[PDB]
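User: Assemble these into one structure.

Assistant: Restating your components, then the assembled model:
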Amino acid sequence: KTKEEHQKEVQYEILQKTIPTFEPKESILKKLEDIKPEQVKKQTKLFRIFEPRQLPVYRANGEKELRNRWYWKLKRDTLPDGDYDVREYFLNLYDQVLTEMPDYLLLKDMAVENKNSRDAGKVVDSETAAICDAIFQDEETEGVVRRFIAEMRQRVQADRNVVNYPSILHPIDHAFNEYFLQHQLVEPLNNDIIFNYIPERIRNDVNYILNMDRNLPSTARYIRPNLLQDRLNLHDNFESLWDTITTSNYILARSVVPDLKELVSTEAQIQKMSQDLQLEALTIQSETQFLTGINSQAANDCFKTLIAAMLSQRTMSLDFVTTNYMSLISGMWLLTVVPNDMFIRESLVACQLAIINTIIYPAFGMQRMHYRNGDPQTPFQIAEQQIQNFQVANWLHFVNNNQFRQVVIDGVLNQVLNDNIRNGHVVNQLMEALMQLSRQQFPTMPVDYKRSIQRGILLLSNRLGQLVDLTRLLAYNYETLMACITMNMQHVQTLTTEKLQLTSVTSLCMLIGNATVIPSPQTLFHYYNVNVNFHSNYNERINDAVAIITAANRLNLYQKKMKSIVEDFLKRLQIFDISRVPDDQMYRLRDRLRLLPVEIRRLDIFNLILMNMEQIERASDKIAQGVIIAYRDMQLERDEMYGYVNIARNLDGFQQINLEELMRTGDYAQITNMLLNNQPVALVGALPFITDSSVISLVAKLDATVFAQIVKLRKVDTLKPILYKINSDSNDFYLVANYDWVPTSTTKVYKQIPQQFDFRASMHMLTSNLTFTVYSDLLAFVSADTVEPINAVAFDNMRIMNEL
Amino acid sequence: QFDFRASMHMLTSNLTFTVYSDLLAFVSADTVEPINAVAFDNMRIMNEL
Amino acid sequence: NSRDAGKVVDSETAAICDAIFQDEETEGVVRRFIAEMRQRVQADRNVVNYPSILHPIDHAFNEYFLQHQLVEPLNNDIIFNYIPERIRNDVNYILNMD
């Protein structure tokens, strides 16, 4: 007997290892309630990739000029070597910008005094102040520019809530900061928005009195959560993820279902049931287990389980002992009120067959149903056609057709109940059928057992008023808490179910009092806030995953593993044990994420980064864009930044070999053949280089000696072409100056010169709001109260519980 | 001779599945009350008062 | 040495791939071929294809193993029908699943 339980544990562990649900279910509540609204990031300084730097310049003869020039240089020149590494670096930059993207900006916080201003001028940011001071003190600056720096002013319009500040920014930096300023997430907040933020079915419920006892200034802001419905359709073809989602929703719902109050005394009800059932005078092999499990704790557990399972759309398994006919009698009410599609098919079939073959068919003297599993009809569906009695037949018809109805409210799919369940009127039909069964002969049944069954049926039937009140309470609590759901209530048969003891159903049926309990306004607000936080986080993490996947694909990062992205996404969803996610579902999630379009903000940031990739990379001083190996002697170019330099402005006129493709393929036949035969070529790819200032190195022709290692090792990661920088700073520049010769080399480094700092092209006026306050908890502005539970009414304006 | 290109084959399998050993472990079975247990003729197996 | 950083089966195939790729005498075409050796996943069909280096007889044996496996799909209907028909047809027993 224990061996079979061990084997069952083994098989259930095998099944459970495929579900990413955290094993201590109750911890899911903490992990869900820890999900906060998207953190509102604020900018403290302007986003900058470049800064102006003073660099020495040289004349056409290679002599160092007496004045430096301003050029744009990367603040952090940390670019890697290799084209693939550069593209990975730019993906990392994209992720950095996304993480540090401000939700809103207030330029006055970053404004600082302009030292040279004659009229109390201010600039954003302190870096702008440093740049402006450096330009003002420079001797080569135009007098007009100096006067403008002394005169340029900020404009603060407080009545308009606007601020304009001068700023010095590189065009890429200005583009980024302008996008941040122009596309802030904050929107105006007023009491109308907060009132509309409440679920519409709660604003209409007379049991809740909502007031706006707060005044919101026009400078009030809030960030709207992203409440798009599921773009991944996790209810479809993701069995394990959907099991986890439904389990988390069920755990969350259990925490918000109210606790029952003023239940019937358990001792009195137990003695009543013992007296009516007379089990001591029977031949039952379960004499004491019959009434075991009937207590207030079990009744509360049943209430919570039913409402939470319906709210989360989690499948339920019915656990019962067939010999316990009181459990079956209570299950009749359970099947009356709870939609039959909320139970796993086998459990519903088993419970219905037990009811049919223990109570109903024996009552009418019918041959016990020989049900065949897998039949499209349930046992009740057969019994309805096979039973002529109108009471039992009508009850069976309702039980057969009481599935959830689908309706979209405020863009959210909701599973709603039959109006007869909502008002509890179907309990009257259940009572009618129960009375009919209590009056039946049970032709061949022993009379003591028949009397016990009929007295149990009467036990359930004489609680008609209590059961009507209980059904109305269940339906009202379900509807009120469903008003707080923001994600579509998809009905899927989950892998694992929530076990429901029919003894707990008996507890609820036999111990429910007349005390109405409804969700507290703060409980409703907490449930709605948790649901909104989970939905918004889900959408934001979908957006992040889709953005990163699209960036990796469009950046041609073919060695990137989207599995890591999907794992990070599931981890940030906070309710998945990623180790237990099946691989097929992981790859399906990857595909579905790939198919989604990218969010507008992230897509725009990626467009900026992609279009400025080339300029940012060529601004680097650590890597070059390639190397031309031309076995003819080529005059060293004369450049202001170097003096004489073997620099190539373009690769025109040379066959190009992509170093990334050569590295990946491993076929060095073509490159080897060209290097052995001295065929002019251009090796293209982000390359580190050595700056050689020695004229003797140029005469020794060392720049041409750095390519044989490619043939030797069949590697291109160690290729470091020589860049000549021959100027008056060279120890042997006298060789250039004092002899009649043309400095030439057989190799050129394909690289770009820096961008000169132009004041007119870098001076901008950044505009923002003077100030505002961003709020997160809108429902904190709502004063919510509830009527006395005695006076709580249902959808039909009658009291939820009337047996008073 | 070992031809590397000619020796390459794409082996295809199911990406993932779980194999179960005891099917009846997934079935929970119980009995009706023995007093009401019936035989092949639809009557109770034991009938004597 | 895969361009896409893909996977192969088994580890012995990877050892052969490394030995061939690193060998100085290997033709560049073979290195190109090794660079493209990656797996393909069809999640919708629940299928995966992996490159492997196998002798024709070895490939025949492993192909037979792959194409003649003993596992069949399992669902609730199959588990229920695993019970003898007369036990299920017996009204004295109630069978349930969760």
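Chain B touches chain A at residues 15-16, 18, 20-22, 25-26, 30-36, 38, 42-44 (CB under 8 Å).
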